[PDB]
Protein backbone atom coordinates (compact mmCIF):
# COMPACT_ATOMS: atom_id res chain seq x y z
CA UNK A 1 0.00 0.00 0.00
CA UNK A 2 1.90 3.01 1.35
CA UNK A 3 5.61 3.43 0.57
CA UNK A 4 7.49 5.04 3.49
CA UNK A 5 9.90 7.18 1.49
CA UNK A 6 13.32 7.96 2.97
CA UNK A 7 12.71 5.57 5.85
CA UNK A 8 15.24 3.01 7.06
CA UNK A 9 13.87 0.29 9.33
CA UNK A 10 15.45 -2.64 11.18
CA UNK A 11 14.02 -6.12 10.73
CA UNK A 12 14.82 -9.38 12.51
CA UNK A 13 13.09 -12.38 10.93
CA UNK A 14 14.52 -14.64 13.63
CA UNK A 15 12.63 -12.75 16.35
CA UNK A 16 9.37 -12.48 14.44
CA UNK A 17 6.18 -13.42 16.27
CA UNK A 18 4.17 -13.67 13.05
CA UNK A 19 6.09 -16.90 12.43
CA UNK A 20 4.97 -18.40 15.74
CA UNK A 21 1.37 -17.27 15.38
CA UNK A 22 0.96 -18.72 11.90
CA UNK A 23 2.67 -22.01 12.75
CA UNK A 24 0.17 -22.29 15.61
CA UNK A 25 -3.11 -21.21 14.00
CA UNK A 26 -2.96 -21.61 10.21
CA UNK A 27 -4.53 -24.65 8.54
CA UNK A 28 -4.59 -25.51 4.83
CA UNK A 29 -7.82 -24.83 2.96
CA UNK A 30 -9.06 -26.13 -0.37
CA UNK A 31 -11.80 -24.98 -2.70
CA UNK A 32 -13.34 -26.53 -5.82
CA UNK A 33 -11.86 -25.07 -8.99
CA UNK A 34 -12.90 -25.22 -12.64
CA UNK A 35 -10.43 -25.02 -15.52
CA UNK A 36 -12.86 -25.07 -18.49
CA UNK A 37 -11.63 -25.14 -22.09
CA UNK A 38 -13.17 -25.45 -25.53
CA UNK A 39 -12.26 -27.93 -28.23
CA UNK A 40 -12.49 -26.98 -31.88
CA UNK A 41 -12.86 -29.87 -34.33
CA UNK A 42 -13.10 -29.65 -38.12
CA UNK A 43 -16.10 -31.56 -39.44
CA UNK A 44 -14.36 -32.83 -42.58
CA UNK A 45 -16.62 -35.74 -43.52
CA UNK A 46 -16.43 -36.93 -47.12
CA UNK A 47 -14.44 -36.19 -48.92
CA UNK A 48 -11.88 -33.59 -47.81
CA UNK A 49 -13.88 -30.35 -47.64
CA UNK A 50 -14.29 -29.08 -44.08
CA UNK A 51 -16.28 -25.85 -44.22
CA UNK A 52 -17.69 -26.62 -40.78
CA UNK A 53 -16.19 -26.83 -37.32
CA UNK A 54 -17.69 -28.19 -34.14
CA UNK A 55 -17.18 -26.17 -30.99
CA UNK A 56 -17.34 -28.23 -27.80
CA UNK A 57 -16.98 -27.43 -24.11
CA UNK A 58 -14.53 -29.69 -22.34
CA UNK A 59 -12.05 -30.18 -19.48
CA UNK A 60 -14.90 -30.69 -16.99
CA UNK A 61 -12.75 -32.24 -14.26
CA UNK A 62 -13.15 -30.49 -10.92
CA UNK A 63 -10.13 -30.50 -8.64
CA UNK A 64 -9.50 -28.77 -5.34
CA UNK A 65 -6.98 -25.95 -5.26
CA UNK A 66 -5.45 -24.45 -2.09
CA UNK A 67 -6.91 -21.14 -0.95
CA UNK A 68 -4.33 -18.40 -0.25
CA UNK A 69 -4.19 -17.31 3.41
CA UNK A 70 -3.27 -13.74 4.43
CA UNK A 71 -2.03 -12.56 7.81
CA UNK A 72 -3.68 -9.24 8.69
CA UNK A 73 -2.45 -6.81 11.35
CA UNK A 74 -4.90 -6.08 14.22
CA UNK A 75 -6.63 -2.72 14.68
CA UNK A 76 -4.13 -0.08 15.79
CA UNK A 77 -1.22 -1.95 14.20
CA UNK A 78 0.36 -2.35 10.79
CA UNK A 79 2.79 -4.52 8.87
CA UNK A 80 6.12 -3.18 7.65
CA UNK A 81 7.25 -4.86 4.44
CA UNK A 82 10.83 -4.94 3.18
CA UNK A 83 10.96 -4.15 -0.54
CA UNK A 84 14.68 -4.78 -0.93
CA UNK A 85 14.59 -7.76 -3.31
CA UNK A 86 17.61 -9.40 -1.66
CA UNK A 87 17.01 -8.79 2.04
CA UNK A 88 18.82 -11.24 4.30
CA UNK A 89 16.17 -10.82 6.99
CA UNK A 90 18.42 -9.09 9.54
CA UNK A 91 19.36 -5.43 9.70
CA UNK A 92 18.36 -2.22 7.85
CA UNK A 93 15.84 -2.09 5.00
CA UNK A 94 16.48 1.16 3.14
CA UNK A 95 13.20 0.75 1.23
CA UNK A 96 10.07 0.04 3.27
CA UNK A 97 6.30 -0.13 2.74
CA UNK A 98 3.23 -0.32 4.96
CA UNK A 99 0.65 -3.00 4.21
CA UNK A 100 -2.51 -4.13 6.01
CA UNK A 101 -2.03 -7.78 5.10
CA UNK A 102 0.73 -10.16 3.94
CA UNK A 103 0.93 -11.65 0.46
CA UNK A 104 -1.18 -14.78 -0.03
CA UNK A 105 0.34 -17.92 1.49
CA UNK A 106 -0.60 -21.46 0.42
CA UNK A 107 0.63 -23.53 3.41
CA UNK A 108 2.34 -26.86 2.74
CA UNK A 109 3.78 -29.22 5.36
CA UNK A 110 7.15 -30.48 4.11
CA UNK A 111 10.78 -31.24 4.93
CA UNK A 112 13.80 -30.87 2.62
CA UNK A 113 12.00 -29.04 -0.18
CA UNK A 114 9.77 -25.97 -0.05
CA UNK A 115 6.85 -26.21 -2.44
CA UNK A 116 4.40 -23.74 -3.96
CA UNK A 117 6.31 -20.92 -2.29
CA UNK A 118 7.58 -17.49 -3.34
CA UNK A 119 10.62 -17.07 -5.59
CA UNK A 120 13.57 -14.70 -5.25
CA UNK A 121 12.91 -11.79 -7.59
CA UNK A 122 16.57 -11.38 -8.61
CA UNK A 123 19.20 -13.97 -7.73
CA UNK A 124 19.13 -17.19 -5.71
CA UNK A 125 19.06 -16.21 -2.04
CA UNK A 126 20.26 -18.34 0.87
CA UNK A 127 19.47 -17.39 4.47
CA UNK A 128 20.20 -18.58 8.00
CA UNK A 129 19.74 -17.38 11.54
CA UNK A 130 23.44 -18.14 12.05
CA UNK A 131 25.67 -19.44 9.24
CA UNK A 132 28.42 -20.18 11.77
CA UNK A 133 26.06 -22.42 13.76
CA UNK A 134 25.99 -25.54 11.60
CA UNK A 135 22.87 -26.52 13.57
CA UNK A 136 20.76 -23.69 12.18
CA UNK A 137 18.76 -24.59 9.07
CA UNK A 138 19.87 -22.86 5.86
CA UNK A 139 16.87 -21.70 3.84
CA UNK A 140 17.37 -21.54 0.08
CA UNK A 141 15.14 -19.40 -2.13
CA UNK A 142 15.29 -20.11 -5.86
CA UNK A 143 14.64 -17.50 -8.53
CA UNK A 144 13.11 -20.00 -10.96
CA UNK A 145 10.97 -22.94 -9.89
CA UNK A 146 11.75 -26.58 -10.61
CA UNK A 147 8.65 -28.59 -11.49
CA UNK A 148 8.03 -31.89 -9.69
CA UNK A 149 5.32 -34.25 -10.96
CA UNK A 150 3.81 -36.59 -8.39
CA UNK A 151 1.32 -39.39 -8.88
CA UNK A 152 -0.66 -41.50 -6.43
CA UNK A 153 1.21 -44.41 -8.03
CA UNK A 154 4.01 -43.53 -5.64
CA UNK A 155 6.66 -41.63 -7.57
CA UNK A 156 7.78 -38.06 -8.34
CA UNK A 157 9.44 -36.74 -11.51
CA UNK A 158 12.06 -34.02 -11.84
CA UNK A 159 13.89 -33.05 -15.01
CA UNK A 160 17.55 -33.87 -14.38
CA UNK A 161 18.78 -30.94 -16.45
CA UNK A 162 16.69 -28.44 -14.45
CA UNK A 163 17.80 -29.93 -11.17
CA UNK A 164 21.50 -29.90 -12.08
CA UNK A 165 21.25 -26.22 -13.02
CA UNK A 166 19.60 -25.54 -9.66
CA UNK A 167 22.35 -27.32 -7.77
CA UNK A 168 25.03 -25.36 -9.61
CA UNK A 169 23.35 -22.10 -8.64
CA UNK A 170 22.81 -23.07 -4.99
CA UNK A 171 26.38 -24.32 -4.78
CA UNK A 172 27.60 -21.05 -6.25
CA UNK A 173 25.86 -19.08 -3.50
CA UNK A 174 27.30 -21.37 -0.82
CA UNK A 175 30.85 -20.96 -2.15
CA UNK A 176 30.10 -17.25 -1.78
CA UNK A 177 29.21 -17.60 1.91
CA UNK A 178 31.69 -20.25 3.08
CA UNK A 179 34.78 -19.58 0.95
CA UNK A 180 35.13 -18.49 -2.69
CA UNK A 181 37.47 -21.44 -3.04
CA UNK A 182 35.80 -24.48 -1.48
CA UNK A 183 34.38 -27.72 -2.90
CA UNK A 184 30.60 -27.90 -2.41
CA UNK A 185 29.19 -31.35 -1.69
CA UNK A 186 25.61 -32.56 -1.35
CA UNK A 187 24.80 -35.82 0.43
CA UNK A 188 21.72 -37.61 1.76
CA UNK A 189 20.30 -37.26 5.27
CA UNK A 190 22.37 -38.89 8.02
CA UNK A 191 19.37 -40.71 9.48
CA UNK A 192 16.33 -40.22 11.66
CA UNK A 193 12.57 -40.48 11.33
CA UNK A 194 10.88 -41.00 7.94
CA UNK A 195 9.57 -37.42 7.93
CA UNK A 196 13.17 -36.25 8.15
CA UNK A 197 15.14 -38.72 5.98
CA UNK A 198 12.81 -38.43 2.98
CA UNK A 199 11.28 -35.56 1.04
CA UNK A 200 8.16 -35.63 3.19
CA UNK A 201 5.19 -33.48 2.27
CA UNK A 202 1.42 -33.44 2.23
CA UNK A 203 -1.17 -33.50 -0.50
CA UNK A 204 -4.63 -33.13 1.02
CA UNK A 205 -4.92 -35.70 3.80
CA UNK A 206 -2.12 -37.89 2.47
CA UNK A 207 1.61 -37.57 3.05
CA UNK A 208 4.25 -38.53 0.52
CA UNK A 209 7.55 -39.95 1.74
CA UNK A 210 9.95 -39.70 -1.20
CA UNK A 211 13.39 -41.27 -1.48
CA UNK A 212 15.41 -38.11 -2.16
CA UNK A 213 18.93 -39.56 -2.36
CA UNK A 214 19.05 -39.09 -6.14
CA UNK A 215 18.65 -35.32 -5.61
CA UNK A 216 21.37 -34.82 -2.99
CA UNK A 217 24.51 -36.66 -4.12
CA UNK A 218 27.01 -34.63 -6.13
CA UNK A 219 30.24 -32.64 -5.87
CA UNK A 220 30.88 -29.10 -7.10
CA UNK A 221 33.92 -26.97 -7.98
CA UNK A 222 36.51 -29.74 -7.94
CA UNK A 223 38.73 -29.76 -11.04
CA UNK A 224 22.52 -39.88 -17.15
CA UNK A 225 18.76 -40.21 -17.66
CA UNK A 226 16.81 -37.08 -18.59
CA UNK A 227 14.24 -37.61 -15.83
CA UNK A 228 14.78 -38.30 -12.14
CA UNK A 229 12.14 -40.60 -10.67
CA UNK A 230 11.82 -40.61 -6.89
CA UNK A 231 10.22 -43.67 -5.21
CA UNK A 232 7.42 -42.70 -2.80
CA UNK A 233 5.33 -44.27 -0.06
CA UNK A 234 1.99 -42.59 0.68
CA UNK A 235 0.26 -42.69 4.08
CA UNK A 236 -2.84 -41.06 5.49
CA UNK A 237 -2.22 -39.20 8.73
CA UNK A 238 -5.43 -38.21 10.54
CA UNK A 239 -3.59 -36.68 13.52
CA UNK A 240 -2.32 -33.91 11.19
CA UNK A 241 -5.78 -32.87 10.03
CA UNK A 242 -6.83 -29.38 11.09
CA UNK A 243 -8.56 -29.61 14.47
CA UNK A 244 -10.28 -26.41 15.55
CA UNK A 245 -12.19 -26.81 18.79
CA UNK A 246 -14.76 -29.58 18.43
CA UNK A 247 -14.69 -29.83 14.61
CA UNK A 248 -12.12 -31.67 12.50
CA UNK A 249 -11.55 -30.64 8.86
CA UNK A 250 -11.10 -33.61 6.58
CA UNK A 251 -9.25 -32.56 3.40
CA UNK A 252 -10.35 -33.59 -0.11
CA UNK A 253 -9.70 -37.25 -1.05
CA UNK A 254 -6.83 -38.72 -3.08
CA UNK A 255 -8.16 -38.10 -6.59
CA UNK A 256 -9.29 -34.56 -5.74
CA UNK A 257 -6.06 -32.64 -5.21
CA UNK A 258 -3.18 -32.65 -7.65
CA UNK A 259 -0.02 -33.79 -5.90
CA UNK A 260 2.39 -32.15 -8.34
CA UNK A 261 3.87 -28.75 -7.48
CA UNK A 262 6.65 -26.18 -7.91
CA UNK A 263 9.83 -26.39 -5.85
CA UNK A 264 10.68 -22.81 -4.87
CA UNK A 265 13.29 -23.51 -2.21
CA UNK A 266 15.26 -26.00 -0.13
CA UNK A 267 16.02 -26.61 3.52
CA UNK A 268 19.60 -27.65 4.25
CA UNK A 269 22.00 -28.28 7.12
CA UNK A 270 25.76 -27.91 6.86
CA UNK A 271 28.09 -30.40 8.56
CA UNK A 272 30.52 -29.75 11.41
CA UNK A 273 33.99 -30.83 12.47
CA UNK A 274 35.48 -27.75 10.82
CA UNK A 275 37.71 -29.93 8.65
CA UNK A 276 39.46 -27.18 6.69
CA UNK A 277 39.45 -29.45 3.64
CA UNK A 278 38.23 -26.27 2.03
CA UNK A 279 35.08 -28.22 1.21
CA UNK A 280 31.70 -28.10 2.96
CA UNK A 281 29.06 -30.84 3.13
CA UNK A 282 25.33 -30.11 2.86
CA UNK A 283 22.29 -32.30 3.55
CA UNK A 284 18.47 -32.07 3.22
CA UNK A 285 17.06 -30.48 6.38
CA UNK A 286 13.62 -29.89 7.83
CA UNK A 287 11.27 -31.18 10.50
CA UNK A 288 10.93 -27.70 12.02
CA UNK A 289 7.92 -26.09 10.30
CA UNK A 290 8.94 -22.70 11.69
CA UNK A 291 11.77 -22.74 9.15
CA UNK A 292 9.12 -23.13 6.44
CA UNK A 293 7.16 -20.12 7.71
CA UNK A 294 10.30 -17.99 7.95
CA UNK A 295 10.89 -18.53 4.24
CA UNK A 296 7.74 -16.55 3.43
CA UNK A 297 7.57 -14.18 6.42
CA UNK A 298 11.16 -12.85 6.42
CA UNK A 299 10.17 -9.49 4.95
CA UNK A 300 7.40 -8.66 7.44
CA UNK A 301 7.11 -7.31 10.96
CA UNK A 302 4.18 -5.96 12.96
CA UNK A 303 4.41 -2.49 14.50
CA UNK A 304 2.10 -0.10 16.36
CA UNK A 305 0.52 2.84 14.52
CA UNK A 306 1.05 6.28 16.06
Amino acid sequence: EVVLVNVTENFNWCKNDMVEQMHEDICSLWDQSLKPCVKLTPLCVGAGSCNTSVITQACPKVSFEPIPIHYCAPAGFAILKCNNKTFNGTGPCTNVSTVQCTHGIRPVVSSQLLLNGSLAEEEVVIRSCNFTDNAKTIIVQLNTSVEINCTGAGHCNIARAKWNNTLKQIASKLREQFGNNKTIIFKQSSGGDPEIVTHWFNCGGEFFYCNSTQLFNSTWFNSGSDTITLPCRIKQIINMWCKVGKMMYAPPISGQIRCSSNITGLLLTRDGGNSNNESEIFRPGGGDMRDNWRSELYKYKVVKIE
Partner: antibody
Amino acid sequence: QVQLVESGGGVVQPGRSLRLSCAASGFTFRNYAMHWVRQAPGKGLEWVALIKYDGRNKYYADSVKGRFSISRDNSKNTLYLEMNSLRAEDTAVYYCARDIGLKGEHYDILTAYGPDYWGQGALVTVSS
Amino acid sequence: DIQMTQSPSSLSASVGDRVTITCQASQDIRNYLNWYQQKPGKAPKLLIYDASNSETGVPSRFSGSGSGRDFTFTISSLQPEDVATYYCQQHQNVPLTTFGGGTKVEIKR
Protein backbone atom coordinates in the same frame (compact mmCIF):
# COMPACT_ATOMS: atom_id res chain seq x y z
CA GLN B 1 30.38 -41.29 19.06
CA VAL B 2 26.74 -42.02 19.86
CA GLN B 3 26.34 -41.65 23.61
CA LEU B 4 23.27 -41.88 25.84
CA VAL B 5 23.40 -41.33 29.60
CA GLU B 6 20.50 -41.84 31.99
CA SER B 7 20.30 -39.92 35.26
CA GLY B 8 18.03 -39.74 38.29
CA GLY B 9 17.89 -43.34 39.45
CA GLY B 10 17.48 -44.45 43.05
CA VAL B 11 14.94 -45.28 45.73
CA VAL B 12 11.35 -44.00 45.73
CA GLN B 13 8.53 -45.17 47.99
CA PRO B 14 5.27 -46.73 46.69
CA GLY B 15 2.75 -44.18 45.44
CA ARG B 16 5.30 -41.41 44.92
CA SER B 17 6.77 -40.16 41.64
CA LEU B 18 10.18 -39.96 39.93
CA ARG B 19 11.55 -38.46 36.71
CA LEU B 20 14.46 -39.91 34.76
CA SER B 21 16.34 -38.07 32.04
CA CYS B 22 18.80 -39.02 29.30
CA ALA B 23 21.64 -36.85 28.01
CA ALA B 24 22.26 -37.40 24.30
CA SER B 25 25.27 -36.51 22.15
CA GLY B 26 27.14 -37.76 19.08
CA PHE B 27 24.18 -37.41 16.72
CA THR B 28 21.41 -34.96 15.83
CA PHE B 29 19.01 -35.68 18.69
CA ARG B 30 16.08 -33.77 17.20
CA ASN B 31 15.95 -36.09 14.17
CA TYR B 32 15.58 -39.42 15.99
CA ALA B 33 12.66 -41.01 17.81
CA MET B 34 13.47 -42.30 21.30
CA HIS B 35 12.48 -45.32 23.43
CA TRP B 36 12.20 -46.24 27.09
CA VAL B 37 12.73 -49.91 27.86
CA ARG B 38 12.85 -51.45 31.33
CA GLN B 39 14.14 -54.72 32.75
CA ALA B 40 13.07 -56.02 36.15
CA PRO B 41 15.57 -57.99 38.27
CA GLY B 42 16.71 -61.02 36.26
CA LYS B 43 13.77 -60.81 33.89
CA GLY B 44 13.23 -59.75 30.29
CA LEU B 45 13.28 -56.54 28.27
CA GLU B 46 9.89 -54.85 28.47
CA TRP B 47 9.16 -51.93 26.13
CA VAL B 48 7.65 -48.99 28.01
CA ALA B 49 7.34 -45.86 25.84
CA LEU B 50 8.21 -44.15 22.53
CA ILE B 51 8.40 -40.49 21.50
CA LYS B 52 8.84 -39.28 17.92
CA TYR B 53 11.45 -36.80 16.65
CA ASP B 54 9.19 -33.76 17.11
CA GLY B 55 8.15 -34.84 20.59
CA ARG B 56 4.54 -34.79 19.43
CA ASN B 57 3.39 -38.40 18.91
CA LYS B 58 3.83 -40.50 22.05
CA TYR B 59 3.19 -44.22 22.56
CA TYR B 60 2.88 -46.22 25.80
CA ALA B 61 2.71 -49.85 26.91
CA ASP B 62 -0.56 -50.85 28.59
CA SER B 63 1.12 -51.61 31.93
CA VAL B 64 2.38 -48.06 32.49
CA LYS B 65 -0.45 -46.46 30.51
CA GLY B 66 -1.97 -43.56 32.43
CA ARG B 67 0.79 -43.47 35.05
CA PHE B 68 3.86 -42.78 32.89
CA SER B 69 4.62 -39.77 30.69
CA ILE B 70 7.28 -39.35 28.00
CA SER B 71 8.69 -36.09 26.62
CA ARG B 72 11.84 -34.53 25.19
CA ASP B 73 13.75 -31.26 25.11
CA ASN B 74 15.41 -30.95 21.71
CA SER B 75 17.05 -27.73 22.88
CA LYS B 76 19.02 -29.44 25.64
CA ASN B 77 19.25 -32.80 23.85
CA THR B 78 17.60 -34.63 26.75
CA LEU B 79 14.80 -37.21 26.97
CA TYR B 80 12.53 -37.42 30.01
CA LEU B 81 10.33 -40.03 31.64
CA GLU B 82 8.12 -39.14 34.57
CA MET B 83 6.54 -42.01 36.47
CA ASN B 84 3.60 -41.66 38.89
CA SER B 85 1.87 -43.89 41.45
CA LEU B 86 4.77 -46.33 41.46
CA ARG B 87 4.22 -49.93 42.56
CA ALA B 88 6.68 -52.68 43.51
CA GLU B 89 6.37 -54.10 40.01
CA ASP B 90 7.89 -50.89 38.58
CA THR B 91 11.26 -51.62 40.20
CA ALA B 92 13.74 -52.06 37.34
CA VAL B 93 16.64 -50.80 35.24
CA TYR B 94 15.42 -48.20 32.76
CA TYR B 95 17.22 -47.85 29.43
CA CYS B 96 16.84 -45.01 26.99
CA ALA B 97 17.38 -46.18 23.43
CA ARG B 98 17.64 -44.43 20.07
CA ASP B 99 15.32 -45.74 17.37
CA ILE B 100 17.07 -46.76 14.14
CA GLY B 101 16.59 -44.22 11.39
CA LEU B 102 14.88 -44.97 8.16
CA LYS B 103 17.75 -47.05 6.80
CA GLY B 104 18.04 -47.72 3.07
CA GLU B 105 17.16 -51.37 3.72
CA HIS B 106 13.61 -50.47 4.78
CA TYR B 107 10.84 -49.99 2.24
CA ASP B 108 7.83 -48.94 4.29
CA ILE B 109 6.74 -46.20 6.68
CA LEU B 110 6.35 -47.59 10.21
CA THR B 111 5.75 -46.14 13.68
CA ALA B 112 9.12 -47.50 14.82
CA TYR B 113 12.12 -49.37 13.42
CA GLY B 114 13.46 -50.65 16.76
CA PRO B 115 16.36 -49.40 18.92
CA ASP B 116 20.04 -49.45 17.89
CA TYR B 117 21.89 -47.60 20.66
CA TRP B 118 21.17 -48.05 24.35
CA GLY B 119 22.23 -46.23 27.49
CA GLN B 120 23.88 -48.08 30.35
CA GLY B 121 20.64 -47.74 32.27
CA ALA B 122 19.45 -46.31 35.56
CA LEU B 123 18.11 -48.47 38.39
CA VAL B 124 14.85 -47.44 40.04
CA THR B 125 14.05 -49.14 43.33
CA VAL B 126 10.51 -48.80 44.63
CA SER B 127 10.75 -49.32 48.38
CA SER B 128 9.93 -47.80 51.74
CA ASP C 1 -1.18 -57.46 20.17
CA ILE C 2 1.67 -59.61 18.82
CA GLN C 3 3.31 -62.41 20.83
CA MET C 4 6.90 -63.53 20.25
CA THR C 5 8.20 -67.01 20.92
CA GLN C 6 11.84 -68.05 20.90
CA SER C 7 13.38 -71.50 21.02
CA PRO C 8 15.30 -72.90 22.71
CA SER C 9 14.89 -71.18 26.07
CA SER C 10 18.54 -72.01 26.76
CA LEU C 11 21.29 -74.15 25.23
CA SER C 12 24.87 -75.34 25.66
CA ALA C 13 27.34 -75.60 22.80
CA SER C 14 31.08 -75.93 22.25
CA VAL C 15 33.46 -73.31 20.88
CA GLY C 16 33.34 -73.43 17.09
CA ASP C 17 29.83 -74.91 16.98
CA ARG C 18 26.97 -73.49 14.94
CA VAL C 19 24.21 -72.12 17.12
CA THR C 20 20.75 -71.54 15.67
CA ILE C 21 18.03 -69.66 17.54
CA THR C 22 14.52 -69.47 16.10
CA CYS C 23 11.90 -66.78 16.63
CA GLN C 24 8.16 -66.99 15.91
CA ALA C 25 5.41 -64.37 15.69
CA SER C 26 1.73 -64.79 16.51
CA GLN C 27 0.99 -63.10 13.17
CA ASP C 28 2.55 -61.89 9.91
CA ILE C 29 5.27 -59.26 10.47
CA ARG C 30 6.91 -59.20 7.03
CA ASN C 31 10.60 -58.80 7.93
CA TYR C 32 10.20 -56.16 10.61
CA LEU C 33 12.25 -58.02 13.20
CA ASN C 34 15.45 -57.23 15.12
CA TRP C 35 17.87 -59.37 17.15
CA TYR C 36 19.64 -58.11 20.26
CA GLN C 37 22.48 -59.41 22.44
CA GLN C 38 22.77 -58.73 26.18
CA LYS C 39 25.76 -59.82 28.21
CA PRO C 40 25.34 -60.07 32.01
CA GLY C 41 25.18 -56.64 33.66
CA LYS C 42 25.51 -54.66 30.43
CA ALA C 43 22.96 -53.04 28.10
CA PRO C 44 21.68 -54.75 24.93
CA LYS C 45 23.55 -54.19 21.68
CA LEU C 46 21.90 -54.47 18.25
CA LEU C 47 23.23 -57.17 15.92
CA ILE C 48 20.60 -57.62 13.17
CA TYR C 49 17.83 -55.29 12.04
CA ASP C 50 14.89 -56.23 9.79
CA ALA C 51 15.61 -59.98 9.77
CA SER C 52 18.79 -60.22 7.71
CA ASN C 53 20.69 -56.91 7.82
CA SER C 54 23.91 -56.86 9.81
CA GLU C 55 24.49 -53.81 12.02
CA THR C 56 27.75 -51.90 11.58
CA GLY C 57 30.71 -53.24 13.55
CA VAL C 58 28.98 -56.58 14.14
CA PRO C 59 31.28 -59.61 13.64
CA SER C 60 30.86 -61.54 10.38
CA ARG C 61 29.86 -64.68 12.29
CA PHE C 62 26.38 -63.24 13.13
CA SER C 63 23.55 -63.60 10.58
CA GLY C 64 19.74 -63.64 10.33
CA SER C 65 17.06 -64.97 7.95
CA GLY C 66 13.29 -65.31 7.70
CA SER C 67 10.09 -63.40 7.02
CA GLY C 68 6.38 -63.64 7.82
CA ARG C 69 6.07 -65.52 11.10
CA ASP C 70 9.29 -67.57 11.17
CA PHE C 71 12.85 -66.31 11.74
CA THR C 72 16.34 -67.59 12.45
CA PHE C 73 19.43 -66.12 14.11
CA THR C 74 22.76 -67.85 13.59
CA ILE C 75 26.26 -67.75 15.01
CA SER C 76 28.40 -69.61 12.50
CA SER C 77 31.43 -70.23 14.74
CA LEU C 78 30.62 -69.82 18.45
CA GLN C 79 33.25 -67.91 20.46
CA PRO C 80 33.74 -67.60 24.25
CA GLU C 81 32.64 -63.95 24.20
CA ASP C 82 29.33 -64.89 22.53
CA VAL C 83 27.98 -66.07 25.87
CA ALA C 84 24.88 -63.94 26.44
CA THR C 85 21.08 -63.78 26.31
CA TYR C 86 19.59 -63.10 22.87
CA TYR C 87 16.26 -61.38 22.35
CA CYS C 88 14.22 -61.09 19.19
CA GLN C 89 11.89 -58.12 18.80
CA GLN C 90 9.14 -57.18 16.35
CA HIS C 91 8.36 -53.64 15.13
CA GLN C 92 5.37 -54.26 12.85
CA ASN C 93 3.48 -52.05 15.31
CA VAL C 94 3.64 -50.87 18.94
CA PRO C 95 3.77 -52.19 21.59
CA LEU C 96 7.18 -53.54 20.60
CA THR C 97 7.14 -57.07 22.00
CA THR C 98 9.77 -59.78 22.54
CA PHE C 99 10.03 -63.21 24.17
CA GLY C 100 10.19 -62.95 27.96
CA GLY C 101 13.71 -63.99 28.91
CA GLY C 102 14.82 -64.65 25.35
CA THR C 103 17.46 -67.33 24.80
CA LYS C 104 20.46 -67.97 27.04
CA VAL C 105 23.58 -69.26 25.28
CA GLU C 106 26.25 -71.06 27.30
CA ILE C 107 29.58 -72.68 26.46
CA LYS C 108 30.43 -76.30 27.18
CA ARG C 109 34.13 -76.75 27.82
